Amino acid sequence: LVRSLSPGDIVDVTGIFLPAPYTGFKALKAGLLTETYLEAQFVRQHKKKFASFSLTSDVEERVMELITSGDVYNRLAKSIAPEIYGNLDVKKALLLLLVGGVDKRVGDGMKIRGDINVCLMGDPGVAKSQLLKAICKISPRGVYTTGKGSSGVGLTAAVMGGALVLADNGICCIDEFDKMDESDRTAIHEVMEQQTISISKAGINTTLNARTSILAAANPLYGRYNPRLSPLDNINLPAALLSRFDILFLMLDIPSRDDDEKLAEHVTYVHMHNKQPDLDFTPVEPSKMREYIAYAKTKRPVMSEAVNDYVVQAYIRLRQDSKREMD
């Protein structure tokens, strides 16, 4: 059982509960005043994980109930954080975030991530952060942090890590992404080169590896998204960073009489019930879901010639149409 235990870890430790007297002293107590200790017997730690499993024996069966119905993508999509109403697109993408892949190795070699980086903008409501508690609950090796919050020394590793190092190979989640000040933003600005942090300070020359994914919930410049201001004005963030984000979901709220009825019906229905979907959808349990995603990450697909060319042409059209729009 030795070395099984590691610092900072909640664990149910079972064992015979015993004294080991007294070594003396022996004058002071008097007596005998045992003071005891716990002999370890068994060890069960809370919170033990894909991508590592061999089989894929009869567990595929547990995947198939999910597959056979077909339209897995929309099904799972909806099945992420059903607790909130709307934003099927946002969730639609978050499924991808959880899945990730495929990166690449150029054989020389250097790497290209490798993963997805999501932002969620808009304010004050729309419940953006609940999606992040959601994800960091579903994904293993997920970690939820906030700016003031998680200190700069929170993400970097001291010599005696946290956040980014603590959660890597899996999704990291950030709230209040504006208030994080400066030194933090440099870390995160760099981590989109993936595979890196570099700590040159004092007793540390190391460069540790963070394979982290990042999801960042942020609020537009005060108060909320002033439409008389251009984008990038009401987003306080520099363009050096946003180029890194592949998908920025800006969630803006304009009151709509029809829809908000539906919403209110939802948030009244639950509370009133615990289980949200009825007539009809089947919410996919996070456990089996994690299994499916686990079986997903194993594939490493490759592009055909036709989709490539298509991507290119559509990219020229997207560039040209974006710039013809004007500054």
Interacting residues with another protein (CB under 8 A): 3, 6-7, 23-24, 108, 110, 112, 157-161, 165, 186, 189-190, 192-193, 198, 200, 205-207, 232, 238-240, 243, 303, 308-309, 311-313, 315-316, 319-320, 323
State in angstroms the smallest separation of the CB of 262 from another protein: 39
**Which residues, including other chains, have CB under 8 Å from residue 239's CB and lie 6 or more apart?**
232
Residue whose CB is less far from another protein, 159 or 279: 159
Give the CA distances from residue 98 to residues 23, 243, 273, 320, in Å, rounded to whole numbers and listed in that order.
56, 21, 28, 32
CA distance 233 to 302: 39
Q: Which residues of 8-42 are buried (b: 16+ CB within 10 A; e: fewer)?
A: eeeeeeeeeeeeeeeeeeeeeeeeeeeeeeeeeee
- Shortest Å distance, C-beta 253 to another protein: 27
- CA–CA gap between residue 296 and residue 40 (Å, rounded): 40
Min dist. Cβ of residue 181 to another protein (A): 14
Measured between alpha carbons, how far is 93 from 116 in angstroms, rounded to an integer?
Answer: 9
> In this complex, which beta carbon is closest to another protein, that of residue 135 or of residue 165?
165
Nearer to another protein, 1 or 158 (CB): 158
C-alpha to C-alpha distance for 153 and 183, rounded to whole angstroms: 10
To another protein, the closest distance from the beta carbon of 313 in angstroms equals: 7
Which one, 207 or 256, has the nearer CB to another protein?
207
DSSP H helices, the chain, are: 60-68, 72-79, 88-99, 130-138, 152-155, 183-190, 239-242, 257-272, 286-296, 305-324
Instruction: Kindly tell me which of 186 and 268 has the beta carbon lying closer to another protein.
Output: 186
127 is in an annotated binding site: yes
Nearest distance in Å: CB 138, another protein: 27
Q: CA-based angle 255:82:123, to the nearest 5?
A: 35
Would you say 16 or 240 has its CB closer to another protein? 240
User: Quick one: 23 or 52, whose CB is closer to another protein?
Assistant: 23
Asked whether residue 128 is marked as a ligand-binding residue, the answer is: yes
Residue 280 beta carbon to another protein: minimum distance, rounded to whole angstroms: 43
Q: Is 225 annotated as a binding residue?
A: no
- Is 150 part of any known ligand binding site? no
Rg (the chain; Cα; Å): 25
| Cα(93)–Cα(82) distance, integer angstroms | 14
Output 53 or 310, the one with its CB closest to another protein. 310
- Cis amide bond preceding 149, omega within 30: yes
What is the rounded distance in angstroms from the CA atom of residue 70 to the CA atom of residue 281? 13
The least distance separating another protein from the CB of residue 35, rounded to whole angstroms, comes to 16
Task: Say whether 85 counts as a known binding-site residue.
Answer: yes
Instruction: Take residue 145 and report the two structure tokens written for it.
Output: 């942090």
CB of 305: closest distance to another protein in angstroms? 9
How wide is the angle at C-alpha 256 spanned by C-alphas 254 and 258, nearest 5°? 160
Query: Which parts are annotated binding residues for ATP?
Result: 85, 125, 127-129, 219, 244
Query: Which parts are annotated binding residues?
Result: 85, 125, 127-129, 219, 244
